[PDB]
Amino acid sequence: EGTFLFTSESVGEGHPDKICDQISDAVLDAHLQQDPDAKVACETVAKTGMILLAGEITSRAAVDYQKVVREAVKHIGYDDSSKGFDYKTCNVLVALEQQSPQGLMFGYATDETEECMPLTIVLAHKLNAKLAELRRNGTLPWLRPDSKTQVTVQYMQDRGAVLPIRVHTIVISVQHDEEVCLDEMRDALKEKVIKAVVPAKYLDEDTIYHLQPSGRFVIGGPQGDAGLTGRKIIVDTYGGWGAHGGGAFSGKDYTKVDRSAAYAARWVAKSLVKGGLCRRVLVQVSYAIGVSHPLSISIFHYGTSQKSERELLEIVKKNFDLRPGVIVRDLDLKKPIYQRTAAYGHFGRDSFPWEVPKKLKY
Amino acid sequence: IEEGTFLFTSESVGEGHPDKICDQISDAVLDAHLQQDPDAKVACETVAKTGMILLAGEITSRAAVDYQKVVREAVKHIGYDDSSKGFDYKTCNVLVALEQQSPDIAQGVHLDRNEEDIGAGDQGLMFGYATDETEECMPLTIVLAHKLNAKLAELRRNGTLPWLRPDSKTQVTVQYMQDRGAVLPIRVHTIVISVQHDEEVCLDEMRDALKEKVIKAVVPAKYLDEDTIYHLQPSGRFVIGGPQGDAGLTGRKIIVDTYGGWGAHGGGAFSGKDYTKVDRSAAYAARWVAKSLVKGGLCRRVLVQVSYAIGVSHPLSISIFHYGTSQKSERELLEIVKKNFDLRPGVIVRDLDLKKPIYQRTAAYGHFGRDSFPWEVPKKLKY
Amino acid sequence: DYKTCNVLVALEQQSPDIAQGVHLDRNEEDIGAGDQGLMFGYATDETEEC
Amino acid sequence: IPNRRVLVTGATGLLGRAVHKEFQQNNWHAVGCGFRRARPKFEQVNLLDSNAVHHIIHDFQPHVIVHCAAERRPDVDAASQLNVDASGNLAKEAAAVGAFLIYISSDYVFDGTNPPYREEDIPAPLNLYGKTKLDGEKAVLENNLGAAVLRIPILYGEVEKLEESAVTVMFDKVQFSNKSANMDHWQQRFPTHVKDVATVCRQLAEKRMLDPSIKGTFHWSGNEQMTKYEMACAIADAFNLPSSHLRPITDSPVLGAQRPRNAQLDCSKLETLGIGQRTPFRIGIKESLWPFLIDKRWRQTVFH
Ligand SMILES: C[S@@+](CC[C@H](N)C(=O)[O-])C[C@H]1O[C@@H](n2cnc3c(N)ncnc32)[C@H](O)[C@@H]1O
Ligand SMILES: C[S@@+](CC[C@H](N)C(=O)[O-])C[C@H]1O[C@@H](n2cnc3c(N)ncnc32)[C@H](O)[C@@H]1O
Ligand SMILES: [Mg+2]
Ligand SMILES: [Mg+2]
């Protein structure tokens, strides 16, 4: 009928891979606080009782890695062996080689949500946030940090844009304790989590629910599955929408164009949609060796713009300066707020500079 | 003048790039297990670093596997065998942090089930993609990027360019034109090649060699012209490469492994994973479907999405986008796919023969666009 | 905690150079010392266990 | 590996593509060329540069040349222009190598007063387009007596853009039912598939390898007679759409004096030799235009 399904996932703070992303960016943050010009390329690996730091750092800062990693794991919620991991007793190994002193990026934006993101991933992200919140409250005290979610939305194509109709399927898997029973978890996940996150007009009697579909989820965190930095890049970005060139974000400082120009491309894309010029847009920025400005910019507006691609490009050229140096200045990327980006997606939340739409002048 | 033109770029990396070292080691470990135990449950993550290979993850298997030997033999084959190259298989540190698969995952996925009923090893989404712009049904950008690295490795291993080392990076920028939903590659705009090298060989002997022996042997002359930009060894002194002064991980080149930016990706990595992990088997399945549709003449370009819930056998969703390159509707193409394919992992494993220990082959030069793989052989469709 | 601690394994084969110098191709009774070294033994009548 | 060589000029255009395709597949070693947008499938050749034309023909040694003009008819104002001439050079150098040149020409060389028109009939163009097509025939025939001339009417095919054919330009006006659209119901025309014309070009060339007597003018055309208005209604019928928003203008257009009313070509000479293919228009235009359906075009993006 012109109808199609699309699926996206997200994960919780206690997910092994997301643990590593947060620690990687926690290391970055800590370095940037003492030394705004610190070069960081910090990978984290997680497994039963182990956090391993590995990478290159050119920094003047003196960082207590012990404290950084342990406080991160604490915040995440892993504070006892009964939960599979404990910040107080885990092994922290440091293998960073410290010293003393191109690309294709994509930005994407869709008018299907206030946050200008695909509904599928927004919901996926928010379901994990809810679990974390209800775990920390004490409202559902059997919850544990590690969790995954997946949302399938039924869309209708509408002249370039995509129109959410309903939620087709929802998956929630969340690590839990040994007392709570399967029916109580499933009732709770449905009534306290989903129904508080998803607008009622998207839910109906045909919506399929796979809640705790594995049946048991006691063993979790790095014990149940090894974690690595940079292994959730689709979760970090557009959940299968838009496009992606290859680069992971976390553990990398702002001088890596993989991170900061991806942020800028997002900024442009969101500005075009919030500025009413597109209902939906994908922005391609080609950078090339030996040029500051992008070598080429393409703008796929899916036919949702009254203005042509050349017109939109011209609008982009006089409102934006996409030279790395200017990007870090304009978006304030030397500041130590990278850890908050390392869970729940880098795009979607207003608190980030690249999610503040620029008022366009043309 | 512009029309509906655009630039697109894809990279590939050679076997010695630290990330791809991890991918190949993880797949060697998987193959080692499948040689003795075809039903092995493998989730091997590898970490590569100055002087170190660490194995972390989980494996339940009946195989007796000597991890020190498999890891060191892999690094040997990759070509790191001396301090001069920054890494030596004979003397590198090899740590192992491998445990059994979580019993909670076992009971919830595969225990006491008929093969066709085993659940997805995880939740996830996977994409499959095909395009008629090359014989291999792949984007020209990524195909050229892969084949350049493969050429470098070839010319290194048959001694014809003995100054080459294992680490390399290529980027191929092609100029494209849109054609009713398909894409016509017009010309190769730019080619970058960085490759690790001897102390002796001079800069412009390498640059001459990269153009005349590598690019000329790989890229059809029809795509090369006087304007094509060549960035051969752009920085200059790239003698330091591989793990030394660097840190790589399994599953940090997933875009290189697949479509090089084209189509889409759901973010699941391939290497170190047996068939029960649908990140691999369903992605392979979805490539097979996308290639079958294009080779079967039903469209010129296509993207397929599938999704799964852990412990559930049937896909949660399936979707087809033909970019308006088919006379038939996307819904009609979906109906055709539903009739011709069974996308449960318990069935995909039979159709694609995924217990065979042939995975190390896939860990470099991309998992798609090659002759020998079952998922690259299109299915004759009935509709 | 035994259940949740990190365990890392870095075990390789005995050096082939050691093996050939010590025990390969010999009757067990003619096995060489695994290494050089000195060792003491001691006893005292002050307790029953010496 | 095939030894039978052919050179198609204007290979970038709707007609050329179809011709180069029809040959290449059927055991010919087909090379195409074009002035702009030729690369990567075809050779970049400016027909007005004699040095370029010389080198590619010298190096290729074609056993046959099929001379097509790119074309993108707005024409169908019907005035100017052409500086060719270059069909002269092409005829010159085709003879120098001993290649059989097929010159594509038009029914616009005629008056369009006494249909049908035979190959023997006296031409009388009412416009500058008809004039230069007639000049080309002259310029070719007198520079090469071993050459042929295939006259054809209005063209359509599997276009890359709607504007590549004066039949296919109408398709948006057909589709948009919410706006009324005027279309010519005065000029009589015979829409003809370039795929049909291509088959004819292969059959005719394959005869000249046997029999050296094949030369002079020839006529091919589709058998279905249609106005611009009747074509539009036929397109709607093929895709099952309403056509009541289409209004015919039986009055001749602003420059009706420059447009031959009915320049129907008599194809009897060519029908005799067993040369001829006729894809029905309702089946031909369906295969031609489906990629340009509104709903398809919405979907035709680079990314999903
Ligand atoms: C299932 S695991 C990946 C496969 C695993 N490496 C294995 O050995 O089969 C991936 C993620 O699923 C989640 N997970 C772990 N145990 C689970 C269970 N028993 N049920 C559902 N989800 C689980 C965790 O978030 C974990 O990081
Ligand atoms: C023989 S090793 C102990 C290794 C252990 N006993 C074994 O065989 O696995 C102790 C020391 O002897 C020396 N050593 C090592 N290899 C040797 C060899 N092939 N012959 C003689 N001495 C050796 C080194 O100084 C080393 O620290
Ligand atoms: Mg993972
Ligand atoms: Mg995984």
Residue numbers in the entry:
A (entry chain A): 15 to 115, 135 to 395
B (entry chain B): 13 to 395
C (entry chain D): 100 to 149
D (entry chain F): 15 to 90, 96 to 323
From the paper:
The crystallographic structure of the MAT(α2)4(βV2)2 complex reveals that MATβV2 interacts with MATα2 through the insertion of the C-terminal tail of the β subunit into a cavity created at the interface of the MATα2 dimer. The complex has four active sites located at the interface of the MATα2 dimers. In all of the structures the adenine group makes a π–π stacking interaction with F250 of MATα2, supporting the hypothesis that the substrate (ATP) and product (SAMe) can occupy the active site in similar orientations. This observation raises the question of whether the N-terminus of MATβ could regulate the gating loop of MATα2.
S-Adenosylmethionine (SAMe) is the principal methyl donor of the cell and is synthesized via an ATP-driven process by methionine adenosyltransferase (MAT) enzymes. The MATα2β complex is expressed in nearly all tissues and is thought to be essential in providing the necessary SAMe flux for methylation of DNA and various proteins including histones. Here we report the crystallographic and solution X-ray scattering structures as well as biophysical analysis of the MATα2β complexes, providing the basis for fresh insight into this widely utilized system in biology.
